[PDB]
Amino acid sequence: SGFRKMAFPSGKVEGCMVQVTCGTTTLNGLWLDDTVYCPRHVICTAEDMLNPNYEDLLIRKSNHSFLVQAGNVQLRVIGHSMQNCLLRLKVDTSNPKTPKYKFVRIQPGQTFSVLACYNGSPSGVYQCAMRPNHTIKGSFLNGSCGSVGFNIDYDCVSFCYMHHMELPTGVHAGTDLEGKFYGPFVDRQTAQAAGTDTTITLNVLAWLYAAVINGDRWFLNRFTTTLNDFNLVAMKYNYEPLTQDHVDILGPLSAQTGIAVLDMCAALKELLQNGMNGRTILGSTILEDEFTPFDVVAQCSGVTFQ
C-alpha cells in the first residue's frame, strides 16, 4: 500500500504547464500570457553542467534552439533572455487561461501546493513545506524538473517556487519565480547536499501515527522513554532532536490513537536501534520522513478545526 497525500486545488495551474526542450534536454515550464519560464539549466549538455558559464552558453543559442510544447501544440519562441537562474521565453501566442497571478518569495515553515508532473503531464497537486535548510521533501518531485509551487487566495495564484533539482539526499532545491534559489544551492553539478540528510523526526512520528490509524501495530511496544533519552538516540542516528513544541504538535494524533507521544518515541527508538528486519510499515521497508503531521491529519483525521 503506502501513505497517500491529500489532493489540493490546482487553481487552473495545470493549464499553464508546458515543456521546454533544448538540445536533448526536456523539462517543465510555466506559461503565463506570452511568456514561458523554466530552469536555465535546460541549455546545458551533461558536460556543461560540471562548470557552466551560462552567459557564454546562451549566446550560442537562438530562438529556434528552444522547442516549447503545450501538449500536442507548439508555442513558437520569439524571444529569449536569462533572469537569474531562469530562462524567460517569449512565445507567439498567449495562454488563453492565464489566471490572475503574482510572484512571491516565501520562507521556511510556509506551506504551498506543487503541481507534480510525470513525463511532462500534470499528475496531481500536493502540499509541500520548505524546511529550514530550504529544501523540500516530496517523492512526487522525483524524476521531474521545472514543476511549480503556489498558493491560492480567492482568485489570485501566488507562484512561489520552481523546482530545479533533486539532491542525492532525496530532497529538492528550487528558486522563486524571479529565478533566485532558496538556500545556498546552485544550478551546476557539484556536492551541495551537506546539511540536507538529517531525518525529520516530527514527520517520522507523524507517519508512524498514520500507520497505526491504518492498522499497523507490530512496531508498538509496552515501553516508554524520556525526551532526553530519546534525543540521545535520535542524534546518534542523525535525526532532528524532538522539542516539547513538537510533542505538542503531535497531540491531536496522540489523542486520536490513544498512544502517548513518548510511547511512540519508544517504538521509534527500537526501530532505529534494531531496524525493521524486512518488515513493512504502510507499505514501506524504511522509515518515511516526507509526510508532516498536517499531511497525516489531512488524509487520516477526517475534519480538522481551526
Side-chain angles (χ1 to χ4, degrees), residues 86-155:
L86 293 184
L87 203 194
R88 300 179 63 274
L89 300 176
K90 295 299 299 180
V91 292
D92 76 327
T93 197
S94 287
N95 179 345
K97 58 288 177 183
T98 297
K100 174 178 170 55
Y101 76 89
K102 57 178 53 188
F103 288 168
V104 303
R105 182 174 180 90
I106 207 93
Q107 48 199 314
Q110 297 189 266
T111 55
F112 55 96
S113 295
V114 169
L115 173 59
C117 295
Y118 178 70
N119 282 349
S121 50
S123 59
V125 181
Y126 302 113
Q127 284 266 98
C128 291
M130 193 117 61
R131 284 266 91 198
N133 62 21
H134 291 282
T135 62
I136 57 183
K137 315 216 77 157
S139 63
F140 54 93
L141 284 168
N142 173 73
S144 180
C145 183
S147 293
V148 296
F150 54 87
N151 279 290
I152 302 167
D153 289 76
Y154 289 99
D155 67 324

Coordinates of all heavy atoms in Angstrom, one line a residue, residues 86-155:
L86 N 16.6 31.5 -14.2 CA 15.5 31.1 -15.1 C 15.8 31.6 -16.5 O 16.5 32.6 -16.7 CB 14.2 31.8 -14.6 CG 13.5 31.4 -13.3 CD1 12.2 32.1 -13.2 CD2 13.4 29.9 -13.2
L87 N 15.1 30.9 -17.4 CA 15.2 31.2 -18.8 C 13.8 31.8 -19.0 O 12.8 31.2 -18.5 CB 15.3 30.0 -19.6 CG 15.9 30.1 -21.0 CD1 15.6 28.8 -21.8 CD2 15.3 31.3 -21.8
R88 N 13.7 33.0 -19.6 CA 12.4 33.6 -19.9 C 12.3 33.5 -21.4 O 13.1 34.0 -22.1 CB 12.4 35.1 -19.4 CG 12.7 35.3 -18.0 CD 12.7 36.8 -17.6 NE 11.4 37.4 -17.9 CZ 10.9 37.9 -19.0 NH1 11.7 37.9 -20.1 NH2 9.7 38.5 -19.1
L89 N 11.2 32.9 -21.9 CA 11.0 32.8 -23.3 C 9.7 33.5 -23.7 O 8.7 33.4 -23.0 CB 10.9 31.3 -23.7 CG 12.0 30.4 -23.3 CD1 11.7 29.0 -23.7 CD2 13.3 30.9 -24.1
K90 N 9.8 34.3 -24.8 CA 8.6 35.0 -25.2 C 8.1 34.0 -26.3 O 8.9 33.5 -27.1 CB 8.9 36.3 -25.8 CG 9.4 37.4 -24.8 CD 8.4 37.6 -23.7 CE 7.1 38.2 -24.2 NZ 6.2 38.4 -23.1
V91 N 6.8 33.8 -26.4 CA 6.3 32.9 -27.4 C 5.2 33.6 -28.3 O 4.8 34.7 -27.9 CB 5.6 31.6 -26.8 CG1 6.7 30.7 -26.2 CG2 4.6 31.9 -25.7
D92 N 4.9 33.1 -29.4 CA 4.0 33.8 -30.4 C 2.5 33.8 -30.1 O 1.7 34.2 -31.0 CB 4.3 33.3 -31.8 CG 3.6 31.9 -32.0 OD1 3.6 31.1 -31.1 OD2 3.2 31.6 -33.2
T93 N 2.1 33.4 -28.9 CA 0.6 33.4 -28.6 C 0.5 33.4 -27.1 O 1.4 32.8 -26.4 CB -0.1 32.3 -29.3 OG1 -1.5 32.6 -29.3 CG2 0.1 31.0 -28.6
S94 N -0.6 33.9 -26.6 CA -0.8 33.9 -25.1 C -1.6 32.8 -24.6 O -2.5 32.3 -25.2 CB -1.4 35.2 -24.7 OG -0.4 36.3 -24.8
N95 N -1.3 32.4 -23.3 CA -2.1 31.4 -22.7 C -3.5 31.9 -22.5 O -3.7 32.8 -21.7 CB -1.4 31.1 -21.3 CG -2.2 30.1 -20.5 OD1 -3.3 29.7 -20.8 ND2 -1.5 29.5 -19.5
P96 N -4.5 31.3 -23.1 CA -5.9 31.7 -23.0 C -6.5 31.6 -21.7 O -7.6 32.1 -21.4 CB -6.6 30.9 -24.1 CG -5.8 29.6 -24.1 CD -4.4 30.1 -24.1
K97 N -5.9 30.8 -20.8 CA -6.4 30.6 -19.4 C -5.4 31.0 -18.4 O -5.1 30.3 -17.4 CB -6.8 29.2 -19.2 CG -5.7 28.1 -19.4 CD -5.3 28.0 -20.9 CE -4.2 27.0 -21.1 NZ -3.8 27.0 -22.5
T98 N -4.7 32.2 -18.6 CA -3.8 32.7 -17.6 C -4.6 33.2 -16.4 O -5.5 34.0 -16.6 CB -3.0 33.9 -18.2 OG1 -2.2 33.4 -19.4 CG2 -2.0 34.4 -17.2
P99 N -4.2 32.6 -15.2 CA -5.0 33.1 -14.1 C -4.5 34.4 -13.6 O -3.4 34.9 -14.0 CB -4.8 32.0 -13.0 CG -3.3 31.6 -13.3 CD -3.3 31.6 -14.9
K100 N -5.2 35.1 -12.7 CA -4.8 36.3 -12.1 C -3.6 35.8 -11.2 O -3.8 34.8 -10.5 CB -5.9 36.9 -11.2 CG -5.4 38.1 -10.4 CD -6.6 38.6 -9.6 CE -6.1 39.7 -8.6 NZ -5.4 40.8 -9.3
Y101 N -2.5 36.4 -11.3 CA -1.3 35.9 -10.5 C -0.3 36.9 -10.0 O -0.3 38.1 -10.5 CB -0.6 34.9 -11.4 CG 0.3 35.5 -12.5 CD1 1.6 35.8 -12.2 CD2 -0.3 35.8 -13.7 CE1 2.4 36.4 -13.2 CE2 0.5 36.4 -14.7 CZ 1.8 36.7 -14.4 OH 2.6 37.4 -15.3
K102 N 0.5 36.5 -9.1 CA 1.6 37.3 -8.6 C 2.8 36.4 -8.3 O 2.6 35.1 -8.2 CB 1.2 38.1 -7.4 CG 0.7 37.3 -6.2 CD 0.4 38.2 -5.0 CE -0.5 39.3 -5.4 NZ -0.7 40.3 -4.3
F103 N 4.0 36.9 -8.2 CA 5.2 36.1 -7.9 C 5.6 36.6 -6.5 O 5.8 37.8 -6.3 CB 6.3 36.4 -8.9 CG 6.1 35.8 -10.3 CD1 7.0 36.3 -11.3 CD2 5.2 34.9 -10.5 CE1 6.8 35.7 -12.6 CE2 5.0 34.3 -11.8 CZ 5.9 34.7 -12.8
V104 N 5.8 35.7 -5.6 CA 6.3 36.0 -4.2 C 7.4 35.1 -3.8 O 7.5 34.0 -4.3 CB 5.1 35.9 -3.2 CG1 4.0 36.8 -3.6 CG2 4.6 34.5 -3.1
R105 N 8.2 35.5 -2.8 CA 9.2 34.7 -2.3 C 8.8 34.3 -0.9 O 8.5 35.2 -0.1 CB 10.6 35.4 -2.3 CG 11.7 34.6 -1.8 CD 13.0 35.3 -1.9 NE 14.1 34.4 -1.4 CZ 14.8 33.6 -2.2 NH1 14.5 33.5 -3.5 NH2 15.8 32.8 -1.6
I106 N 8.8 33.0 -0.6 CA 8.3 32.5 0.7 C 9.5 32.2 1.6 O 10.6 32.4 1.3 CB 7.4 31.2 0.4 CG1 6.4 31.0 1.5 CG2 8.3 30.0 0.2 CD1 5.1 31.7 1.2
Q107 N 9.2 31.7 2.8 CA 10.2 31.3 3.8 C 10.0 30.0 4.4 O 8.9 29.4 4.3 CB 10.5 32.4 4.8 CG 9.3 33.0 5.5 CD 9.7 34.3 6.1 OE1 10.7 34.5 6.8 NE2 8.8 35.3 6.0
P108 N 11.0 29.4 5.1 CA 10.8 28.1 5.7 C 9.6 28.1 6.6 O 9.4 29.1 7.3 CB 12.1 27.9 6.5 CG 13.1 28.6 5.6 CD 12.3 29.9 5.3
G109 N 8.9 27.0 6.7 CA 7.7 26.8 7.5 C 6.4 27.0 6.8 O 5.4 26.4 7.1
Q110 N 6.4 27.9 5.8 CA 5.2 28.1 5.0 C 4.9 27.0 4.0 O 5.8 26.5 3.4 CB 5.4 29.4 4.2 CG 5.5 30.7 5.1 CD 5.4 31.9 4.2 OE1 6.4 32.5 3.8 NE2 4.2 32.4 4.0
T111 N 3.7 26.7 3.9 CA 3.3 25.6 3.0 C 2.8 26.2 1.7 O 2.4 27.3 1.6 CB 2.1 24.8 3.6 OG1 1.0 25.6 3.9 CG2 2.6 24.0 4.8
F112 N 2.8 25.4 0.6 CA 2.4 25.7 -0.7 C 2.1 24.5 -1.5 O 2.5 23.4 -1.1 CB 3.4 26.6 -1.4 CG 4.8 25.9 -1.6 CD1 5.1 25.2 -2.7 CD2 5.7 26.1 -0.5 CE1 6.4 24.7 -2.8 CE2 7.0 25.5 -0.7 CZ 7.3 24.8 -1.8
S113 N 1.3 24.6 -2.5 CA 0.9 23.4 -3.3 C 1.8 23.3 -4.5 O 2.2 24.4 -5.1 CB -0.5 23.5 -3.8 OG -1.4 23.5 -2.6
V114 N 2.2 22.1 -4.9 CA 3.0 21.9 -6.0 C 2.3 21.0 -7.0 O 1.7 20.0 -6.6 CB 4.3 21.2 -5.6 CG1 5.1 20.7 -6.9 CG2 5.2 22.1 -4.9
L115 N 2.3 21.4 -8.3 CA 1.6 20.6 -9.3 C 2.7 19.6 -9.9 O 3.5 20.1 -10.7 CB 1.0 21.5 -10.4 CG 0.5 20.7 -11.6 CD1 -0.6 19.8 -11.2 CD2 -0.1 21.7 -12.6
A116 N 2.6 18.4 -9.4 CA 3.5 17.4 -9.9 C 3.3 17.0 -11.3 O 2.1 17.0 -11.8 CB 3.4 16.1 -9.0
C117 N 4.3 16.7 -12.1 CA 4.2 16.3 -13.5 C 5.0 15.0 -13.7 O 6.1 14.8 -13.2 CB 4.8 17.3 -14.4 SG 3.9 18.9 -14.4
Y118 N 4.4 14.0 -14.4 CA 5.1 12.8 -14.7 C 5.3 12.8 -16.2 O 4.3 12.9 -17.0 CB 4.3 11.6 -14.3 CG 5.1 10.3 -14.7 CD1 6.2 9.9 -14.0 CD2 4.6 9.5 -15.8 CE1 6.9 8.8 -14.5 CE2 5.3 8.4 -16.2 CZ 6.5 8.0 -15.5 OH 7.2 6.9 -16.0
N119 N 6.6 12.8 -16.7 CA 6.8 12.8 -18.1 C 6.2 14.0 -18.8 O 5.6 13.9 -19.8 CB 6.3 11.5 -18.8 CG 7.3 10.4 -18.6 OD1 8.4 10.5 -18.1 ND2 6.8 9.2 -19.0
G120 N 6.2 15.1 -18.0 CA 5.6 16.4 -18.5 C 4.1 16.5 -18.4 O 3.6 17.6 -18.8
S121 N 3.4 15.5 -18.0 CA 1.9 15.6 -17.8 C 1.6 15.8 -16.4 O 2.0 15.0 -15.5 CB 1.2 14.4 -18.4 OG 1.8 13.2 -18.0
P122 N 0.8 16.9 -16.0 CA 0.3 17.1 -14.7 C -0.2 15.8 -14.1 O -1.0 15.1 -14.7 CB -0.7 18.2 -14.8 CG -0.2 19.0 -16.0 CD 0.3 17.9 -16.9
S123 N 0.2 15.5 -12.9 CA -0.2 14.2 -12.2 C -0.8 14.3 -10.8 O -1.0 13.3 -10.1 CB 1.0 13.2 -12.2 OG 2.1 13.7 -11.5
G124 N -1.0 15.6 -10.4 CA -1.6 15.7 -9.0 C -1.0 17.0 -8.3 O 0.1 17.4 -8.6
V125 N -1.8 17.5 -7.4 CA -1.4 18.7 -6.6 C -1.2 18.3 -5.2 O -2.2 17.9 -4.5 CB -2.4 19.8 -6.7 CG1 -1.9 21.1 -6.0 CG2 -2.6 20.2 -8.2
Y126 N 0.0 18.5 -4.6 CA 0.3 18.1 -3.3 C 0.9 19.2 -2.5 O 1.6 20.1 -3.0 CB 1.2 16.9 -3.3 CG 0.6 15.8 -4.0 CD1 1.2 15.3 -5.2 CD2 -0.6 15.1 -3.6 CE1 0.6 14.3 -5.9 CE2 -1.1 14.1 -4.3 CZ -0.6 13.7 -5.5 OH -1.2 12.7 -6.2
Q127 N 0.6 19.2 -1.2 CA 1.2 20.3 -0.3 C 2.6 19.9 0.1 O 3.0 18.8 0.4 CB 0.4 20.4 1.0 CG -0.9 21.1 0.8 CD -0.8 22.6 1.2 OE1 -0.7 23.4 0.3 NE2 -0.9 22.9 2.5
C128 N 3.4 21.0 0.1 CA 4.9 20.9 0.4 C 5.2 22.0 1.4 O 4.4 23.0 1.5 CB 5.7 21.1 -0.8 SG 5.7 19.8 -2.0
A129 N 6.3 21.9 2.2 CA 6.7 22.8 3.2 C 8.2 22.9 3.0 O 8.9 21.9 3.0 CB 6.3 22.4 4.6
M130 N 8.7 24.1 2.9 CA 10.2 24.3 2.8 C 10.7 24.1 4.2 O 10.2 24.6 5.2 CB 10.4 25.8 2.3 CG 11.9 26.0 1.8 SD 12.0 26.5 0.1 CE 11.0 28.0 0.0
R131 N 11.8 23.3 4.3 CA 12.5 23.1 5.6 C 13.4 24.2 5.9 O 13.7 25.1 5.0 CB 13.3 21.8 5.4 CG 12.5 20.5 5.5 CD 12.5 20.0 6.9 NE 11.3 20.5 7.7 CZ 11.3 20.4 9.0 NH1 12.3 20.0 9.7 NH2 10.2 20.9 9.6
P132 N 14.0 24.3 7.1 CA 14.9 25.4 7.4 C 16.1 25.5 6.5 O 16.6 26.5 6.3 CB 15.3 25.1 8.9 CG 14.0 24.4 9.4 CD 13.6 23.5 8.3
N133 N 16.5 24.3 5.9 CA 17.6 24.3 5.0 C 17.2 24.6 3.6 O 18.0 24.4 2.6 CB 18.3 22.9 5.1 CG 17.4 21.8 4.6 OD1 16.4 22.0 3.9 ND2 17.7 20.5 5.0
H134 N 16.0 25.1 3.5 CA 15.4 25.5 2.2 C 15.2 24.4 1.2 O 15.1 24.7 0.0 CB 16.2 26.6 1.6 CG 16.1 27.9 2.4 ND1 15.0 28.7 2.3 CD2 16.9 28.4 3.3 CE1 15.2 29.7 3.1 NE2 16.3 29.6 3.8
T135 N 15.1 23.2 1.6 CA 14.8 22.1 0.6 C 13.4 21.6 0.9 O 12.8 22.0 1.9 CB 15.8 20.9 0.8 OG1 15.6 20.3 2.0 CG2 17.2 21.3 0.6
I136 N 12.9 20.8 0.0 CA 11.5 20.2 0.3 C 11.6 18.7 0.0 O 12.4 18.2 -0.8 CB 10.4 20.9 -0.6 CG1 10.7 20.8 -2.1 CG2 10.2 22.4 -0.2 CD1 9.7 21.4 -3.0
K137 N 10.7 18.0 0.8 CA 10.6 16.6 0.6 C 9.4 16.3 -0.2 O 8.4 17.0 -0.1 CB 10.5 15.9 2.0 CG 11.5 16.4 3.0 CD 12.0 15.4 3.9 CE 13.0 14.5 3.3 NZ 13.9 13.8 4.3
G138 N 9.4 15.4 -1.1 CA 8.3 15.1 -2.0 C 8.7 14.1 -3.0 O 9.3 14.5 -4.1
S139 N 8.5 12.8 -2.8 CA 8.9 11.8 -3.8 C 8.2 12.1 -5.1 O 8.7 11.6 -6.2 CB 8.5 10.4 -3.3 OG 7.1 10.3 -3.1
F140 N 7.1 12.8 -5.1 CA 6.4 13.0 -6.4 C 7.2 14.0 -7.3 O 7.0 14.1 -8.5 CB 5.0 13.6 -6.2 CG 5.0 14.8 -5.3 CD1 5.1 16.1 -5.8 CD2 5.0 14.7 -3.9 CE1 5.1 17.2 -5.0 CE2 5.0 15.8 -3.1 CZ 5.1 17.1 -3.7
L141 N 8.2 14.7 -6.6 CA 9.0 15.6 -7.4 C 10.1 14.9 -8.1 O 10.7 15.4 -9.0 CB 9.6 16.6 -6.4 CG 8.7 17.8 -6.0 CD1 9.4 18.5 -4.8 CD2 8.4 18.7 -7.1
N142 N 10.3 13.6 -7.7 CA 11.4 12.8 -8.3 C 11.3 12.6 -9.8 O 10.2 12.7 -10.4 CB 11.4 11.4 -7.7 CG 12.4 10.5 -8.5 OD1 13.6 10.6 -8.4 ND2 11.9 9.6 -9.3
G143 N 12.4 12.4 -10.5 CA 12.5 12.2 -11.9 C 11.9 13.4 -12.7 O 11.8 13.2 -13.9
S144 N 11.5 14.4 -12.0 CA 10.9 15.6 -12.7 C 11.7 16.8 -12.5 O 12.6 16.9 -11.7 CB 9.5 15.8 -12.0 OG 8.9 16.9 -12.6
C145 N 11.3 17.9 -13.2 CA 12.1 19.2 -13.1 C 11.2 20.3 -13.7 O 10.6 20.2 -14.8 CB 13.4 19.0 -13.9 SG 14.4 20.5 -13.7
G146 N 11.2 21.5 -13.0 CA 10.5 22.6 -13.6 C 9.1 22.8 -13.1 O 8.4 23.7 -13.5
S147 N 8.6 21.9 -12.3 CA 7.2 22.0 -11.7 C 7.2 23.2 -10.8 O 8.2 23.6 -10.3 CB 6.8 20.7 -10.9 OG 6.7 19.6 -11.8
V148 N 6.0 23.8 -10.6 CA 5.9 25.0 -9.8 C 5.1 24.8 -8.5 O 4.2 24.0 -8.4 CB 5.3 26.2 -10.6 CG1 6.3 26.6 -11.7 CG2 4.0 25.8 -11.2
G149 N 5.4 25.7 -7.6 CA 4.7 25.8 -6.3 C 3.9 27.1 -6.2 O 4.3 28.1 -6.7
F150 N 2.8 27.0 -5.5 CA 1.9 28.2 -5.4 C 0.9 28.1 -4.3 O 0.7 27.1 -3.7 CB 1.2 28.4 -6.7 CG 0.4 27.1 -7.1 CD1 -0.9 26.9 -6.7 CD2 1.0 26.1 -7.9 CE1 -1.6 25.7 -6.9 CE2 0.4 24.9 -8.2 CZ -0.9 24.7 -7.7
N151 N 0.3 29.3 -4.0 CA -0.8 29.3 -3.0 C -1.9 30.1 -3.7 O -1.6 30.9 -4.6 CB -0.3 30.1 -1.8 CG 0.4 29.2 -0.8 OD1 -0.1 28.3 -0.2 ND2 1.7 29.5 -0.7
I152 N -3.1 29.8 -3.4 CA -4.3 30.5 -4.0 C -5.0 31.2 -2.9 O -5.4 30.7 -1.9 CB -5.2 29.4 -4.6 CG1 -4.4 28.6 -5.7 CG2 -6.4 30.2 -5.3 CD1 -5.2 27.4 -6.2
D153 N -5.3 32.5 -3.2 CA -6.0 33.4 -2.3 C -7.1 33.9 -3.2 O -6.9 34.8 -4.1 CB -5.1 34.5 -1.8 CG -4.1 34.0 -0.8 OD1 -3.1 33.4 -1.2 OD2 -4.3 34.2 0.4
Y154 N -8.3 33.5 -2.9 CA -9.5 33.9 -3.6 C -9.3 33.6 -5.1 O -9.1 32.4 -5.4 CB -9.8 35.4 -3.4 CG -10.3 35.7 -2.0 CD1 -9.4 36.1 -1.0 CD2 -11.6 35.3 -1.7 CE1 -9.9 36.2 0.3 CE2 -12.1 35.5 -0.4 CZ -11.2 35.9 0.6 OH -11.6 36.0 1.9
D155 N -9.2 34.6 -5.9 CA -9.0 34.3 -7.4 C -7.6 34.6 -7.8 O -7.3 34.7 -9.1 CB -10.0 35.2 -8.2 CG -9.7 36.6 -8.1 OD1 -9.3 37.1 -7.0 OD2 -9.9 37.3 -9.1

